[PDB]
Symmetry: D2
Subunit: 476 residues, 4 copies
């Protein structure tokens, strides 16, 4: 079908233009002032509002397993939520059983997504163990399946955690495949010791989750991951930046040389972790994810500052909330609570409120950190995250003045609590368009189950590897 957006302000990461936009066959066909349109073309009046590239959520965990349970938002309900929020593409993390085949787990995830997802999607593969025969499955995943990003774990002792030797092995190998190396960075050995100590103190409430994983343990694992990456000369991507001190580590490392990228998630940019000390156990357990929200209320603004000057580059969600019934498995033991929070619907609205409405960054920067930087990093740039002739027709009409108060009483998630409850945000989407067709307009949702396509990603993204290739020949 065919569609035309008249009289808008097109925002890209590089510039802004007043021009009309014409979409046909799931692509942007023309951009200009006086356009030539063929057959049955529907017209949408933009009225001077911003025309931006639909968001790319780099970090989603829609079918994440934790404590024997699956996240409450599946691929259908998850991506339904994303679209309402202005997110037109996600990259979901595939989470294999430690020891199980990556291929088998990839097909399971692909099957579930292709039948339920409302929007285009890519997949990360989380390498949960460095087992014998893992290297051949990785090669197939890069060259045949179309996956260019793999996540390794420094936390979760004796479950997901890799040693310093194993990390070195895996960074080198993935570097050879030209993959983006994602890292969940928290010291798992110290966490294990601290959880043990806190429980034995009598502290069973969700606060103990935040006390057993203070920001220092994140700062350390982040620095350790950057050190390894700089030895090997490969790009390293830090997922779920939750702390001012981990962000400072990333910042300092970018001055020194190492190719490091940082990804705060909506949670860390929106709220803080003081809610762990809530008298309401249910509410407090809804905030539980790893790494935890910082109990320092000054973190959200500090992270947004770093996102503004370029030290943090992409935003995500880390969306994997559980239902109150699900979480209450850990009523007498915080380590038994399912880790995950919401963010997928709120991500662009939240980034906007903290970064643009406050004046820290402009609308051009907002586009980079919600979609464009993500596409450059993961090798999707011309296709996704740009309003250009030839690119996919994933567009959002954004109203910088439209008010929205985030509540669990109106959110498109299955869970009872929302970590941004009562946050009054100054800037919301009006119209969201996915794959050429309108999915959200005037508060009405028209999404199709299974309509999203899997987007394959080529190895060796130039944004990351162009500097790697040069540093290889300088080294020797």
């Amino acid at each position: 079908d065919r569609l035309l957006i008249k009289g808008g302000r097109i925002i890209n990461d590089d510039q802004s233009l007043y021009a009309d936009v014409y979409l046909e066959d799931g692509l942007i066909k023309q951009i200009g002032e006086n356009l030539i349109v063929p057959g049955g073309v529907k017209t949408i009046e933009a009225n001077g509002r911003m025309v931006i590239p639909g968001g790319i959520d780099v970090n989603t965990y829609l079918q994440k397993p934790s404590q024997g349970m699956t996240a409450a938002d599946d691929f259908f309900q998850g991506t339904r939520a994303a679209l309402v929020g202005g997110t037109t593409m996600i990259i979901d993390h595939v989470v294999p059983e430690p020891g199980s085949s990556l291929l088998t787990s990839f097909e399971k995830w692909h099957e579930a997504a292709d039948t339920k997802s409302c929007c285009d999607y890519s997949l990360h593969v989380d390498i949960t163990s460095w087992y014998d025969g893992v290297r051949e499955e990785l090669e197939v995943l890069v060259q045949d399946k179309g996956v260019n990003s793999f996540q390794v774990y420094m936390a979760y002792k004796d479950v997901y955690q890799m040693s310093d030797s194993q990390l070195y092995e895996a960074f080198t190998f993935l570097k050879g495949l030209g993959a983006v190396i994602l890292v969940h960075a928290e010291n798992g050995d110290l966490i294990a010791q601290e959880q043990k100590r806190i429980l034995e103190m009598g502290i069973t409430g969700p606060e103990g989750h935040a006390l057993s994983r203070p920001e220092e343990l994140e700062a350390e694992a982040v620095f350790r991951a950057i050190t390894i990456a700089g030895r090997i000369n490969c790009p390293v991507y830090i997922t779920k930046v939750m702390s001012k001190s981990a962000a400072d580590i990333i910042a300092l490392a970018r001055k020194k040389g190492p190719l490091v990228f940082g990804e705060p998630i909506a949670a860390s940019l929106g709220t803080d972790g003081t809610h762990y000390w809530s008298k309401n156990w249910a509410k407090a357990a809804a905030f539980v994810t790893s790494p935890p929200l910082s109990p320092d209320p000054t973190t959200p603004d500090y992270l947004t500052s770093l996102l503004a000057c370029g030290d943090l580059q992409v935003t995500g969600s880390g969306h994997c909330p559980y239902s109150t019934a699900q979480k209450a498995v850990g009523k007498d033991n915080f380590t038994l609570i399912p880790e995950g929070v919401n963010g997928i619907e709120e991500r662009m609205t939240v980034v906007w409120d903290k970064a643009v409405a406050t004046g820290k960054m402009d609308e051009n920067q907002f586009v980079a950190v919600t979609s464009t930087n993500a596409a450059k990093i993961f090798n999707l740039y011309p296709r996704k995250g740009r309003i250009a002739v030839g690119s996919d027709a994933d567009v959002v009409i954004w109203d910088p003045d439209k008010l929205k108060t985030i509540t669990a009483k109106s959110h498109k998630s299955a869970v009872e609590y929302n970590i941004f409850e009562g946050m009054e945000c100054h800037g919301s989407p009006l119209v969201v368009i996915s794959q050429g067709k309108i999915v959200f307009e005037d508060g009405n949702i028209n999404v199709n189950k299974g309509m999203g396509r899997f987007i394959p990603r080529k190895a060796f993204p130039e944004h990351l590897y162009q500097r790697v290739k040069i540093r290889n020949k300088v080294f020797g």
Copy 2:
């Protein structure tokens, strides 16, 4: 006129693609892999070489031995297809008269497109009205103020606050020459009384501390008023760090290292050869710390410094010999208009610090976004001006005073072996450099007018005005 570039790797600041570039009528007309062009169309084979937008030198002092023709000629040889030259009036005289004088001399001599900075050497009565004329009528959106040169060009803190507020009202880019003029004065007296008269005394009267100080004062003023500030000629680690730290906090500060400070250091002031030492004399001075050119490049790579310039101001040995007995009398300027893109490439891309995309960003694209010239300049895209360089990353160039396109006897990058230089240069749809042959037209360059309120700078300012109040 009609031109086609086959088999080149097109390099913008955002992505790189293998495609042909098709030029006609002063603009890029088409980009694609299999371009169907008329028979007989003049074709250039790039053969895997890089196709980058021609550089934009943001800091040039050509007008104040080498004329404006020779300057843009050397620019073009080095890959710079646009300059922004600084208008320098005597303090008290009309800005309009000095602008018109510059504009005339350039329009008849410039080989490449150009814009103009106007330096506000004095905040005299009646300067506000002239500034409105320069912005709305004359197409100038950038102005430099000085904090150095006591009793000559220097503006007090009260004056600077007034100037920044008024210039914020116009939507102008405020450039700053940041050194403490009052303290430099005291340091000049002390060094002269010590018997030091040679050019080494110019570096000791202007230590990096005094630079870092004025830079910080400049940012402080800008942060209070809520206006962007642009720091010209970043020469020192300490000043650079001030800028890198202020970016993180809030204020809208931009740094411009010049080729000189990226390529060489200031140990050459201590040479036994007076004529060699004197050639390095500029303000602010090259840091005597040899670790400076790497550090600066590192900040360019991460994003703390944004644009590169040259600070080009050619003086002959005879013209420099004026200060043979007093370093404060030595004319201030170095070379670099030609070497700029070659030096930046060698220090930042050849070493591995950054890639070819960020190279384009620091040599053209960022300057365009800042001074309101994008996407007209600094991008290879349909509709943009045909200012295109066929860059060869492996082509050897040795910088010398024998082969360079200037009448000055000494080069500050003398002996520097670079790996990556221009092969073919295209300005306004026409080939001006090819196979070592220069083919430039005297007076061919057009003046480019720049609107006020560059979106890159002022969109944040606009939002901040609503928030802070």
Copy 3:
């Protein structure tokens, strides 16, 4: 007289030991466990409590008709654990320093309860100021002078005047003190804030942002590093200005910072109070930071050593004296309280939290100050031959600061309601018990002026070497 403290834990900046202290004729005579002494001596049982040197407040403005005179202040200082203060002499711009110093000296010698020394504030760099500075140093015994970068066309010196003053004071071997705020920029913000329609005390904080302090501080350091002299930054009030100092200390320049009890204990959210009289009580220069995270941050820097001394900047004014600027914030008199609360606030923020130990507490309340200003080991040390200015400190004695209980006539206390975990029990000054079990036994005019010698070693030993080191020269060519 003659006094013996037994069973106490003597705490100096360098170590802590269990011993008894024996005082005689205002000096410490013996320290040991089995002291052989006369058997008719007055004796105080400490019971394992801390015996620390009496504090030194390096920043007071008591002589500015006031609600509290020099006597009420020094009485309050003693009760709070402070046994010596260094007051600023504030002359008229253009007038004589010698004349104003004698006026301050006269009033102080007849009112002071405790020992005292005097800072001389150079309000103007007038023709013939150099001759009087030599006199104050060589004849009167003043080694510290404050210059102002703030207050345009009143106290402010230009960059050129500062360089001139710094070089001349270096030659004298004086401690250069600096009130660092950009005067010119404050003026511009003052005009703008008032035109906005803001007349309240909140406008004081808005016209003097923390970035304007930071700037002047960096400038002051930049000048001091070039001349090679020690610079002392009074009233460090902001995170940004404390960082400038921390950084400069690593680069070379001999810079010292002085946070006051105010900036370590409370913030400036109270400027935005509905109650005008309360908000006006907080008004001082530089202002308290609206950033509530500031007092902790500064205490951290005190504890790692980037800040060295604590003062109070005490300048007492009644609610009726403040009300001069009820319709204009710039006319409000600048001054807060803290001469009585200083050591209690510093302890509660620094030692009760675990940031520093009792030993560093001694360093930051007396010893460092003494070293800097050339009063060591006369003051700031419990050692044989040192002055008998002793305090018996109980690390667990609760004290709630209120306007009802404070030793002052002022209606408002900036530390109002703050609960503290460490107080003074016994305070001894010149060998006489001046505070015991709540009882205040002071003597008006008892306090001696202390002359301070030029060229204190703690600052100028490094200067004397760097002068000889000053390498790199013009080439012969």
Copy 4:
């Protein structure tokens, strides 16, 4: 026996005072101007020269040249006490390696000494031996390792276990901070580039791997709330890590050694293999020649606190074992004799710090940290008679021909130092008097140290109450 120093300017960490010092029975008995003394006393005129406390070298590896020639060299150098590292096999007992170290030193040492015990493996049964060492044997300092994979290296969990136990014992926890797991991989990477020379040592242990391990060591200690001590700070990048932590809270102490303060690692690239091998120590000397300057500044402002030497003497023949593989070259440099002289030259003569700070970083701070103050590191009545008369003008140029070591190469070769010891008194005996050496083998005493040094543990005690 009995001794009197007149006309001298006593320099302590806190003040300087012109006064005379009287020594008797190995202690300092009187300090004053006109002292009443017995008749049979030797009088030394100081002539306005500096009278400072003898140095404390906190980092020596003499038994890993013997104990006698080292403490001789130390004495000559100004250092009147060293703290030597007891290094066991990961197949030997701490109790036995201790007594083997103790018996060797007590019969050879010229100056007073204390012992560190290096915990090379966290084995089952170690906790009992440690309780013996603290309570019965007089050791309050222990060093754990994060480098040397599968030999000395402890896992993070073992560090956690170890830091906790040691904190309960009231000890000083020393860390050798380099990442062993990454070093091993970088060794291979450099060997397969065909670099076998000593320069391969510097390249296989870049500073990033030290800074990482330091930061991880600090991070652990902050969770446990114990004081942590970083030995052999060799890099700006590690030194910054330490600097930044100090202002954030954690109780961290850093010990640059004379080598990293006085020279750099450009000498690994020397054409003469024997010389470059002589510079091989771990962590390596930084190839960055800005390092020694940077490190001395950090010593000046207070971010580094004590100076050691890491003195580990190997002859050229013993170094030759790794002529074809840098990984087999024994790690050790010299510095026990030079430590004070070098520190004076780089810190005091440059004007970064004054003589008072000089005493701090050469003795006093050490004494505070390891619980030897005010017995050591202070000229005061009752304190030990370990005095040095220091001449700030006396030239000492450093050469392998002149030094008191059987090694062929000196890492401070040809450094011209202004400022050196004139007289050196140890235990109230003159052992060095302007070139004239008179030491006695075995005269040095073992000095036991108590647990819970207040300099470190006063703040821990408080932080134990506040956190929970």
